[PDB]
Scaffold this active site. Structure first.
Site, PDB file in Angstrom:
ATOM      1  N   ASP A  68       1.449  -8.726  -0.206  1.00  0.00           N
ATOM      2  CA  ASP A  68       0.689  -9.287   0.405  1.00  0.00           C
ATOM      3  C   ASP A  68      -0.660  -9.530   0.060  1.00  0.00           C
ATOM      4  O   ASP A  68      -1.232  -8.960  -0.868  1.00  0.00           O
ATOM      5  CB  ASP A  68       0.569  -8.293   1.848  1.00  0.00           C
ATOM      6  N   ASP A 127       5.523  -2.336  -0.100  1.00  0.00           N
ATOM      7  CA  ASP A 127       5.085  -3.705  -0.567  1.00  0.00           C
ATOM      8  C   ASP A 127       3.897  -3.490  -1.373  1.00  0.00           C
ATOM      9  O   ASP A 127       3.462  -2.115  -1.614  1.00  0.00           O
ATOM     10  CB  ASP A 127       4.714  -4.678   0.678  1.00  0.00           C
ATOM     11  N   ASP A 142      -0.359  -4.541  -1.566  1.00  0.00           N
ATOM     12  CA  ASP A 142      -1.302  -5.511  -1.109  1.00  0.00           C
ATOM     13  C   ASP A 142      -2.494  -5.658  -1.656  1.00  0.00           C
ATOM     14  O   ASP A 142      -2.899  -4.739  -2.398  1.00  0.00           O
ATOM     15  CB  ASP A 142      -1.636  -4.555   0.479  1.00  0.00           C
TER      16      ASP A 142
HETATM   17 MG   LIG Z   1       1.437  -1.960   2.009  1.00  0.00          MG
END
Ligand SMILES: [Mg+2]
Ligand code: NA
Length: 356
Positions: free
Chosen positions: A280, A196, A198
């Site tokens: 995120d 992901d 962040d």
């Molecule tokens: Mg991460």
DNA sequence: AAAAAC
DNA sequence: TTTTTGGC
DNA sequence: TTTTTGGC
DNA sequence: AAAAA
């Protein structure tokens, strides 16, 4: 000269000279993790972490001398790898049905340990059969997890994380001109890939309303453009006048959101012309920005040893919000990560040296 | 925190 | 009511 | 020997 | 599973 047992007292770059050993220890940790054998799992993880900080490859058993977190079991693993270049224990775990099912099922966004175990115990072995099973009921996360599965399992690369950063920064600065937007997680540690992307958002002058509304304006702006594939906004439980607040939940008090963004290829430096990306976003009050940054930079092992060192070495309590000194009975304030390290009596570790 | 089974 | 998942 | 292991 | 209490 002496290697510390704490990751927060070691410099861990992405230059792993002991990858064959650490890869096998990672598999053994996951095997104990799925079995909820917490102590053994953490022992394999700690052994894998310390080997990552080594500035040379282990080429003999004499090389393991003086290195903490390496007992007789880890030593026998290392010894076996030196013998033929393979780990018979790790290889046995890789061919295990329960282990394969665990890795496979938890690779779906919204499927964790408990759901994976239920599905394995129910006789499921493949994702297709789970998906087509008319008796099962999937959560909203799992539905997105199955819908964008192949994009989500393919790791986000650096040009993709950079394109996401440009998108996140442009959108946040549009709605909050003075916002400080910092990419956190793996990519701040100089990783070339990640699961992901962040981010941490903060503003020196946003009002309480502007601060709480930023994630709502930014995600609504993307929903208007059809770019928001998944959005979960978790409101803050951070009450400035009610600190500390011990949660049952391991996640912090900050307002945060877990997203799936539609990332057009035209933004990255063919197929369907886009890629689903986990993103995120954390919004923190300005005064807590150093603790939030330290907390969200990682790595996971670096974070848990910072806390463990604070507890057992300094009689202090560290979290993503504050640093509490139990002896002096005071919260230690900090406007930078350097200040937190100094409060803990630790030499400053650069974000790209926290790859423990 | 939010979902969701309940 | 409960459990489960999401994060470093 | 038991306790702790992110009082996430 | 490994280190500290
Ligand atoms: Mg991460
Ligand atoms: Na998952």
């Amino acid at each position: 000269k002496k290697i510390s047992q704490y990751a927060c007292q070691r410099r861990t770059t992405l230059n792993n000279y002991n990858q064959l050993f650490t890869d096998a220890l990672d598999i053994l940790a996951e095997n104990d993790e799925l079995r909820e054998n917490e102590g053994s799992c953490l022992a394999f993880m700690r052994a894998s972490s310390v080997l990552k900080s080594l500035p040379f490859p282990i080429t003999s058993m004499k090389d393991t001398e003086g290195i903490p977190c390496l007992g007789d079991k880890v030593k026998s693993i290392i010894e076996g790898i030196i013998e033929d270049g393979e780990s018979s224990e790790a290889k046995a775990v890789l061919n295990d049905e329960r282990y394969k099912s665990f890795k496979l099922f938890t690779s779906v966004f919204g499927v964790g340990l408990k759901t994976a175990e239920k599905w394995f115990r129910m006789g499921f072995r493949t994702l297709s059969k789970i998906q087509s099973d008319k008796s099962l009921r999937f959560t909203q996360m799992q539905k997105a997890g199955f819908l964008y599965y192949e994009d989500l399992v393919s790791c986000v690369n650096r040009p993709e994380a950079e394109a996401v950063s440009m998108l996140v920064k442009e959108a946040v600065v549009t709605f909050l001109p003075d916002a400080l937007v910092t990419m956190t997680g793996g990519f701040r540690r100089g990783k070339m890939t990640g699961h992901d992307v962040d981010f941490l958002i903060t503003s020196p002058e946003a009002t309480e309303d502007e601060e709480q509304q930023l994630l709502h304006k930014v995600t609504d702006f993307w929903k208007q453009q059809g770019l928001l594939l998944y959005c979960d906004i978790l409101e803050s439980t951070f009450e400035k006048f009610k600190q500390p607040s011990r949660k049952v939940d391991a996640l912090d008090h900050f307002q945060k959101c877990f997203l799936i963004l539609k990332l057009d290829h035209g933004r990255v430096h063919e197929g369907k012309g886009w890629k689903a990306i986990r993103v995120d976003l954390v919004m923190c009050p300005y005064d807590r920005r150093a603790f939030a940054l330290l907390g969200w930079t990682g790595s996971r092992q670096f974070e848990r040893d910072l806390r463990r060192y604070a507890t057992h070495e300094r009689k202090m309590m560290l979290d993503n919000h504050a640093l509490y000194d139990r002896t002096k009975r005071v919260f230690l304030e900090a406007e930078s990560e350097e200040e937190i390290f100094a409060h803990l009596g630790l030499d400053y570790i650069e974000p790209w040296e926290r790859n423990a």
